[PDB]
Ligand binder design. Structure first.
Ligand SMILES: Nc1ncnc2c1ncn2[C@H]1CC[C@@H](C(=O)Nc2ccc(S(=O)(=O)C(F)(F)F)cc2)CC1
Length: 351
C-alpha cells in the first residue's frame, strides 16, 4: 500500500485498538496486503515483535476496506455474529471499512469438502448458523428477488466484443424468463424451512483453524456473510453441494475447473445431513430409525431441488459480473458451466 493509505490504516489501528496500539508511532506500524483489488481489500496490520502486550489486545488484526441501507444490515450482522463468537471479533468500524480479529488459519480447498470429518463439521456449523435469530426480515424474499434483479440486468446487457455476444446469445436462447418461472413453480411446491442462511458456503469461505488440524469436530469457522439472509434452508445446503463441483484455485483462464462428477453421492449427502439434522433439531437423535429415515429421504429431494436455484442464481450473477467486474475471471464460461449443470440436474431429477 501507498504512503497515504498506510497513514489511514496506522491511524485506524492506533485510534481504535487498545493497549500497545495506543502509544505506537507511525515508524513502528506493520501492514501488508492479503488481498488487493478495488473491492473488499484485506490487509494484516501488526505490532513489532519487540513490543510487549499490555492487556487483552491482539498482536495481529485484519483490516478490511470496502472500496466500491446495505451497510447498516451487514454491520449489525457482523457485530452480532462476533458477540456470539460465530465470526471474527469486531474491533473497529468506520465508513471506509472495519478492523476484525485475524484468524490464523487457511481456506479449505475444493477437494477437502468431501473429507467425512470436514463435511460433518460444515454441516454442524451450518446448522448452528441456521439457528441464529437475527433482527432481519424473516420472509424468504432474497432468493427469487435476487434472481429477478440479476435477470433484469442480464436482459439489458449488450457486449461490445464479439465472442461475448455469442456466449450471451446462447444463454439467452434458453428463455431465461420462462425458465425462472419453471424453477419458482418447482420450488413453491418443495417444503423448506426458512432460516438464517449463509447463502455462499464455499471452500474459500471456510477457514481451517491453525493448531486444530487434529481436532475431529472443532477445526473450522464459516466466514464472509455478505450474502447472508433469511432463506430456504434447502438453498444453503444445495448451494454447498454444488460447490463440490467447482474449484476456483485453477491458475489459468478461465480460473476455475468444473467437475460434474464431484457432486456428492447419495452416501456423501446422507453423511452431511446426518450431521446437520441432530445439530439443527436437538431431539432428532431420539426419533425412531424409521422416522429419521423418512425425514432424511425428504430432505434429499429438498436440497437437490434447491441446488437448481444455486445453478440458476450464480449463472445469472456471473453474466452480470462479466459486464461490470474488475476481477480476472472467466465469468461467461462460469455462467455456461452453471447453466449446463442446471439442465443436467433437471434431467437427473426428472423435472
Ligand atoms: N477475519 C477474517 N476474515 C476473513 N478472512 C480471514 C480472517 N482472518 C484470517 N483470514 C484469512 C486467513 C487465511 C488467508 C491468509 O492468512 N492470507 C494471508 C495472510 C498473511 C499474508 S502476509 O501479510 O503477506 C504474510 F505472509 F503473512 F506476511 C498474506 C496472505 C486469508 C485470510
Amino acid at each position: 500500500p501507498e504512503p497515504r493509505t498506510r497513514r489511514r490504516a496506522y491511524l485506524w489501528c492506533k485510534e481504535f485498538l487498545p493497549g500497545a496500539w495506543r502509544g505506537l508511532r507511525e515508524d513502528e506500524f506493520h501492514i501488508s496486503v492479503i488481498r488487493g483489488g478495488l473491492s473488499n481489500m484485506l490487509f494484516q496490520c501488526s505490532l513489532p515483535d519487540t513490543t510487549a502486550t499490555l492487556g487483552d489486545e491482539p498482536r495481529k488484526v485484519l483490516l478490511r476496506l470496502y472500496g466500491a441501507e446495505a451497510m447498516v444490515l451487514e454491520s449489525v450482522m457482523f457485530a452480532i455474529l462476533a458477540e456470539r463468537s460465530l465470526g471474527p471479533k469486531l474491533y473497529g468500524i468506520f465508513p471506509q471499512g472495519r478492523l476484525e480479529q485475524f484468524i490464523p488459519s487457511r481456506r479449505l480447498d475444493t477437494e477437502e469438502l468431501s473429507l467425512p470429518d470436514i463435511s460433518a463439521e460444515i454441516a454442524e456449523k451450518m446448522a448452528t448458523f441456521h439457528g441464529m435469530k437475527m433482527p432481519f426480515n424473516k420472509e424468504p424474499k432474497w432468493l427469487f428477488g435476487t434472481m429477478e434483479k440479476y435477470l433484469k440486468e442480464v436482459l439489458r446487457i449488450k457486449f461490445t466484443e464479439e465472442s461475448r455476444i455469442k456466449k450471451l446469445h446462447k444463454l439467452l436462447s434458453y428463455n431465461l424468463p420462462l425458465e425462472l418461472e419453471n424453477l419458482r413453480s418447482l420450488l413453491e411446491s418443495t417444503p423448506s424451512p426458512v432460516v438464517f442462511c449463509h447463502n455462499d458456503c464455499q471452500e474459500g469461505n471456510i477457514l481451517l483453524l491453525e493448531g486444530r488440524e487434529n481436532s475431529e469436530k472443532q477445526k473450522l469457522m464459516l466466514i464472509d456473510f455478505e450474502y447472508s439472509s433469511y432463506n430456504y434452508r434447502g438453498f444453503d445446503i444445495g448451494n454447498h453441494f454444488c460447490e463440490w463441483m467447482y474449484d476456483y484455485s485453477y491458475e489459468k483462464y478461465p480460473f476455475f475447473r468444473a467437475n460434474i462428477r464431484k457432486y456428492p453421492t447419495k452416501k456423501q449427502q446422507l453423511h452431511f445431513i446426518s450431521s446437520y439434522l441432530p445439530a439443527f433439531q436437538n431431539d432428532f437423535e431420539n426419533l425412531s430409525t424409521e422416522e429419521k429415515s423418512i425425514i432424511k429421504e425428504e430432505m434429499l429431494l429438498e436440497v437437490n431441488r434447491f441446488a437448481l436455484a444455486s445453478h440458476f442464481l450464480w449463472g445469472l450473477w456471473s453474466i452480470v459480473q462479466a459486464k461490470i467486474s474488475s476481477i480476472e475471471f472467466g465469468y461467461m464460461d462460469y455462467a455456461q458451466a452453471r447453466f449446463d449443470a442446471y439442465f443436467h440436474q433437471k434431467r437427473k431429477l426428472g423435472v
